[PDB]
Amino acid sequence: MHLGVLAAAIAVGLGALGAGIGNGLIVSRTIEGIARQPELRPVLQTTMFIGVALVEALPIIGVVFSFIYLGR
Amino acid sequence: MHLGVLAAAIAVGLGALGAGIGNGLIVSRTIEGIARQPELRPVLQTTMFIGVALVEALPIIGVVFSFIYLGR
Amino acid sequence: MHLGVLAAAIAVGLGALGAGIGNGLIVSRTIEGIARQPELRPVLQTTMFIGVALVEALPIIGVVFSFIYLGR
Amino acid sequence: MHLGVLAAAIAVGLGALGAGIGNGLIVSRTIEGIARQPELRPVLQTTMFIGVALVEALPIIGVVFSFIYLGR
Amino acid sequence: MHLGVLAAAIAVGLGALGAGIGNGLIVSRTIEGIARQPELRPVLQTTMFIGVALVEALPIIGVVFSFIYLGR
Amino acid sequence: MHLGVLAAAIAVGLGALGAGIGNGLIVSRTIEGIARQPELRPVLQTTMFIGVALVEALPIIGVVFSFIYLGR
Amino acid sequence: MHLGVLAAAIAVGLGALGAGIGNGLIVSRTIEGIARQPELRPVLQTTMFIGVALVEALPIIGVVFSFIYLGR
Amino acid sequence: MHLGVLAAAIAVGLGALGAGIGNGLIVSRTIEGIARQPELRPVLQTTMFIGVALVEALPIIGVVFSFIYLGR
Amino acid sequence: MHLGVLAAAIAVGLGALGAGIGNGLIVSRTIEGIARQPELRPVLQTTMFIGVALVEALPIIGVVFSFIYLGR
Amino acid sequence: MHLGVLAAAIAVGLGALGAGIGNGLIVSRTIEGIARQPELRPVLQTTMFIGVALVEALPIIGVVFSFIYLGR
């Protein structure tokens, strides 16, 4: 089961990488849009937060799937 | 079947990575477009949501295919 | 045929990654263009949809080819 | 010939990835350019289509080469 | 357990890579947005900081998961 | 010579990837520049075409080199 | 322990890569924001410096973790 | 010497990838700059050409080095 | 110790890659910011130089660490 | 010493990739900045050239290090 540790480790690493850069950029860019024009400022950042929920859904479910695949 | 765990783990990791960055950026950029000009604001974000459905279709189907390939 | 599972799994992962980021960005950017100027708004998003068809053609055919290569 | 399946699978995956992101971005950006200014709108999108033909030429020929290399 | 060291090492490397580029860009872009327009300057940078917390949550949890997978 | 097939397959995949994204983006961006300002429109797109010739020179020669290396 | 050297070497390489590009871009973009508008110029660059501290925290801790994993 | 073929094949693939995307983008962006403002148009594109010479110097020398390393 | 050569070779390659693209972009973007507005031109480029020092610190230390890991 | 050839080949490939894209983009972007505003045009491109010297310093030294590691 030594390979399983790496499989999950790389999968999680991939999950962290994807959501990490996706959300990092999502926050800054969201912020940049708000700064450019003061139109629906709270709403734009709120959309950003839902984006965070959506993007992180993938790494969370990916980790769960990796766990189950290793388990069964 | 030890290799199968890694195959699915990396495939899912790839799926999470692609949709995660694609949707993260899709949300922020969508938001940025809305902020730049107050034209069809609800529609633009709605298009973003359909984009989410389209982009995540790929990781969902990819995971399913990986499962079946391992299974058969 | 254990290697075949990984071959298809990584190929599909690659397919999901390419189209996922390509279409995710295509949707948001398409949206951003429409937001910037209200010129041919329906047409621009329509072009985006055909872009989706074009980009996903690659992962779909790639998956099919992977299946056949494994099969024969 | 088990390695051959992976060789073609990864090559095609690479082909799908390159053209998929290249064309996805080509469509959205082409669209963005048209939206920014209403100058030679049909021509710009047409150039985009030829771009599609050019970019996909690479994955198509790559797949063919992979097939022949495996074959001979 | 020699493979375990690499599994965690690459996972952490992936974690550092994702959050490192995500937060690096988040800080500069956040800064760029503030510079472009003097609207809600403290708030925009504050949003950036929460972005940092969100993005680094992934590498921190990823490292923890890698540790546990190696442990059990 | 089983490894040779993969060597060429990955090299070509790399060639398709580099030129595919390079030319895809070159076409759309070239198009975007023309759209932004109606200055030397034919010339700008022409420069784009020479760019295509230059960028694809690399994958073409790379494939040839891979073939010869396998051959000798 | 030969694999351990590579594990740390690649982890550090990953650490250098992530922070290197993250901070390189953070410095230039920070600079670009300041150049665009003369608003809170010292503060913006200062935020950039804290960004540097944050981003490099990841590679530093990653290297430390790699060392300990190899050690124990 | 079977590994040597792959070493050169991947090195060349890397060379084609780097210069291919670097020059593809260099041509389009160069073009975009010229389009934005009609200032020193011939000179800007000329600088682009020297950029091509500089960027391709790397893949050319890399291929030569790979050949010699295999040879000796 | 044959693996050690590759470990350092890839680590250095990673170091060169990260700082190379980080500093290459840092120089051009820094330059672009200065060109956009003639405000604190020497200072902006100077900040760029310190950025170079910061970014290259990572590859230099990474190479040193790789050397020591191989050594001990 | 068969692995050594690949180690240097991939390291050089990495070196060419990093500097190739870094300098390719540095030239075009430098050019774009000059085109946007006619301020210190020779100086900006000159800064670009020093950027080239800085960025290529990394691949040159990386290749040298790879050679020595293989040698000793």
CA angle F37, F43, F45 (to 5 degrees): 80
F50 at H interface, C-beta within 8 A = yes
B25 at A interface, C-beta within 8 A = yes
Structure tokens, F48: 């784009």
Please judge whether G16 and I14 are an interchain contact, meaning their C-beta atoms are less than 8 angstroms apart.
Answer: yes
Nearest CA among I67, J48, D13, C21 for reference residue A25: C21
Using CA atoms, how far apart are residues F18 and F16, in angstroms rounded to an integer?
Answer: 6
**All partners of chain J with 3 or more CB pairs under 8 angstroms:** H, I
Please judge whether A30 and B28 are an interchain contact, meaning their C-beta atoms are less than 8 angstroms apart.
Answer: yes
CB A13 within 8 A of CB B17: no
**Residue for token digits 């594990």?**
G7
Residues of H11-47 as b/e, b for ≥16 C-beta within 10 angstroms? bbbbbbbbbbbbbbbbbbbbbbbbbebeebbeebbeb
Half-sphere exposure of B44 (CA within 13 A, CB side): 30
Helices and strands: H and E segment counts in chain J: 2, 0
Of D39, D56, D66, the CB nearest to F38: D39
CB atoms within 10 A of CB I53: 11
Most A CBs within 10 A among E14, E40, E70, hence the mutation to make, goes to E14
CA angle B64, B67, C1 (to 5 degrees): 130
Nearest CA among I39, I32, H41 for reference residue J45: I32
Return the axis-axis angle of helices H41-71 and F41-71, rounded to nearest 10°: 0
Each as own residue / partner, the long-range contacts of residues A47-50 (CB below 8 Å, 24 or more positions apart, any chain) are A47/B27, A47/B30, A47/B31, A47/B45, A48/B27, A48/B28, A48/B31, A50/B27
Structure tokens, H22: 């670097």
CB G16 within 8 A of CB I17: no
SS3 B37: coil
Using CA atoms, how far apart are residues E28 and C9, in angstroms rounded to an integer?
Answer: 37
Residues 6+ apart with CB under 8 A from E40: A34, A35, A38, A41
Q: Nearest 5°: phi and psi at C55?
A: -65, -40
Residues of I in contact with G22 (CB under 8 A): 22
**B13, closest residue in chain A (CA to CA):** A11
Using CA atoms, how far apart are residues H68 and B25, in angstroms rounded to an integer?
Answer: 44
Using CA atoms, how far apart are residues I17 and I45, in angstroms rounded to an integer?
Answer: 22
Using CA atoms, how far apart are residues H61 and H18, in angstroms rounded to an integer?
Answer: 13
**Residue E32 identity:** E
Residues 6+ apart with CB under 8 A from F72: none
Most F CBs within 10 A among H6, H25, H27, hence the mutation to make, goes to H27
Using CA atoms, how far apart are residues B26 and A59, in angstroms rounded to an integer?
Answer: 17
Chain I nearest-CA distance from G40, in A, is 13
CB A62 within 8 A of CB B16: yes
DSSP code per residue over J9-29: HHHHHHHHHHHHHHHHHHHHH
Return the axis-axis angle of helices E41-71 and E2-36, rounded to nearest 10°: 170
Using CA atoms, how far apart are residues D54 and G25, in angstroms rounded to an integer?
Answer: 32
- Name the DSSP letter for residue D19: H
**Residue for token digits 């925290």?**
G57
Chains H & J: contacts with CB separation below 8 Å: 149
Using CA atoms, how far apart are residues B22 and D21, in angstroms rounded to an integer?
Answer: 11
Using CA atoms, how far apart are residues G30 and J29, in angstroms rounded to an integer?
Answer: 16
Structure tokens, A60: 């969370």
Work out how many domains chain G is built from and give that number.
Answer: 1
Using CA atoms, how far apart are residues A60 and A57, in angstroms rounded to an integer?
Answer: 5
**In this structure, what is the dihedral angle of CA atoms C37, C43, C44, C50, given to the nearest 10 degrees?**
180
CB I59 within 8 A of CB I16: yes
Using CA atoms, how far apart are residues F34 and D1, in angstroms rounded to an integer?
Answer: 49
CB B40 within 8 A of CB C35: yes
Alpha helices by DSSP H, listed for H37-71, are 41-71
D5 at F interface, C-beta within 8 A = no
Using CA atoms, how far apart are residues A32 and E27, in angstroms rounded to an integer?
Answer: 11
Task: Tell which phi-psi region holds residue I40, choosing left (phi > 0), alpha (psi between -120 and 50) or beta.
Answer: left
Q: Nearest 5°: phi and psi at D40?
A: 50, 50
Structural gaps in chain C: residues followed by a C–N separation over 2.5 Å: none
Helices and strands: H and E segment counts in chain C: 2, 0
Burial class (CB in 10 A: 0-12, 13-18, 19+), J41: middle
Residues of J in contact with H71 (CB under 8 A): none
**In this structure, what is the dihedral angle of CA atoms J29, A20, E7, G16, given to the nearest 10 degrees?**
30
Using CA atoms, how far apart are residues I29 and J31, in angstroms rounded to an integer?
Answer: 11
CB atoms within 10 A of CB H7: 27
**Residue D68 identity:** I
Nearest CA among G25, F39, D37, J37 for reference residue H32: F39
Residues 6+ apart with CB under 8 A from H1: H70, J2
CB atoms within 10 A of CB D68: 11
Please judge whether C50 and D27 are an interchain contact, meaning their C-beta atoms are less than 8 angstroms apart.
Answer: yes
CB C17 within 8 A of CB D18: no
Residues of J in contact with H37 (CB under 8 A): 35-37
Residues 6+ apart with CB under 8 A from D14: C14, D62, F10, F13, F14, F16, F17
Residues 6+ apart with CB under 8 A from E46: none
Please judge whether A27 and E19 are an interchain contact, meaning their C-beta atoms are less than 8 angstroms apart.
Answer: no
Chain E nearest-CA distance from G42, in A, is 11
Residues of D in contact with C55 (CB under 8 A): 20, 23-24, 27
Using CA atoms, how far apart are residues G29 and G44, in angstroms rounded to an integer?
Answer: 10
Structure tokens, D37: 């200014």
Do F and D make contact via 3 or more CB pairs under 8 A? The reply is yes
Please judge whether A19 and B24 are an interchain contact, meaning their C-beta atoms are less than 8 angstroms apart.
Answer: yes
I15 at J interface, C-beta within 8 A = yes
CB E11 within 8 A of CB A14: no
Structure tokens, G12: 């550090």
Alpha helices by DSSP H, listed for F1-72, are 2-36, 41-71
Do D and E make contact via 3 or more CB pairs under 8 A? The reply is no
Using CA atoms, how far apart are residues H34 and F40, in angstroms rounded to an integer?
Answer: 9
Using CA atoms, how far apart are residues C65 and E19, in angstroms rounded to an integer?
Answer: 36
Burial class (CB in 10 A: 0-12, 13-18, 19+), E63: buried
Using CA atoms, how far apart are residues F47 and F45, in angstroms rounded to an integer?
Answer: 5
Of D2, D24, D30, the CB nearest to C3: D2
Using CA atoms, how far apart are residues B38 and A37, in angstroms rounded to an integer?
Answer: 10
Residue count of chain A = 72
Residue count of chain C = 72
Residues 6+ apart with CB under 8 A from A8: A63, A66, A67, A70, B9, E65, E66, E69
Structure tokens, A28: 């800054």
Q: How was this one solved? A: NMR
Residues of B in contact with C52 (CB under 8 A): 54
Task: Tell which phi-psi region holds residue J45, choosing left (phi > 0), alpha (psi between -120 and 50) or beta.
Answer: alpha
CB atoms within 10 A of CB D72: 7
CB H8 within 8 A of CB F63: no
Residues of A in contact with E17 (CB under 8 A): 17
I54 at J interface, C-beta within 8 A = no
B58 at A interface, C-beta within 8 A = no
Rg (alpha carbons) of chain F, rounded to whole number? 16
Each as own residue / partner, the long-range contacts of residues B48-51 (CB below 8 Å, 24 or more positions apart, any chain) are B48/C27, B48/C28, B48/C31, B50/C27, B51/B23, B51/B26, B51/C23, B51/C24, B51/C26, B51/C27, B51/C28, B51/C31
C25 at B interface, C-beta within 8 A = yes
CB atoms within 10 A of CB B57: 16
Please judge whether H20 and F19 are an interchain contact, meaning their C-beta atoms are less than 8 angstroms apart.
Answer: yes
Chains A & B: contacts with CB separation below 8 Å: 148
E61 at G interface, C-beta within 8 A = no
Residues of D in contact with C66 (CB under 8 A): 5, 8-9, 12-13
Residues 6+ apart with CB under 8 A from I64: none
Of D3, D36, D52, the CB nearest to C37: D36
C33 at D interface, C-beta within 8 A = yes
Q: How far is CA B67 from CA A66, B1, C7, C12, C71, in A?
A: 12, 12, 13, 12, 17
Percent of residues in chain G assigned helix, strand, coil, to nearest 5: 90, 0, 10
B42 at C interface, C-beta within 8 A = no
**All partners of chain A with 3 or more CB pairs under 8 angstroms:** B, E
Please judge whether H15 and F59 are an interchain contact, meaning their C-beta atoms are less than 8 angstroms apart.
Answer: no
Domain of residue F43, residue span: 1-72
Nearest CA among F14, I31, H9 for reference residue G35: I31
J51 at H interface, C-beta within 8 A = no
Task: Give the largest CA-CA distance in chain C.
Answer: 54
C29 at B interface, C-beta within 8 A = yes
CB H60 within 8 A of CB F59: no
CB F48 within 8 A of CB H17: no
Using CA atoms, how far apart are residues G14 and A13, in angstroms rounded to an integer?
Answer: 12
**In this structure, what is the dihedral angle of CA atoms H6, H12, H17, H19, given to the nearest 10 degrees?**
170
Please judge whether G48 and E59 are an interchain contact, meaning their C-beta atoms are less than 8 angstroms apart.
Answer: no
**All partners of chain B with 3 or more CB pairs under 8 angstroms:** A, C
Chain A nearest-CA distance from B28, in A, is 5
Using CA atoms, how far apart are residues H41 and H44, in angstroms rounded to an integer?
Answer: 5
Residues of A23-48 as b/e, b for ≥16 C-beta within 10 angstroms? bbbbbbbbbbbbbebeebbeebbebb
Chain G nearest-CA distance from E72, in A, is 15
- Cα I17 to chain centroid distance, Å, stands at 8
Q: Nearest 5°: phi and psi at C36?
A: -60, -45
Using CA atoms, how far apart are residues G70 and G64, in angstroms rounded to an integer?
Answer: 10
Strand residue runs (E) in I1-72: none
Using CA atoms, how far apart are residues B34 and B29, in angstroms rounded to an integer?
Answer: 9
Please judge whether H55 and J13 are an interchain contact, meaning their C-beta atoms are less than 8 angstroms apart.
Answer: no
**Residue for token digits 């150049």?**
G35
Structure tokens, C67: 């299946």
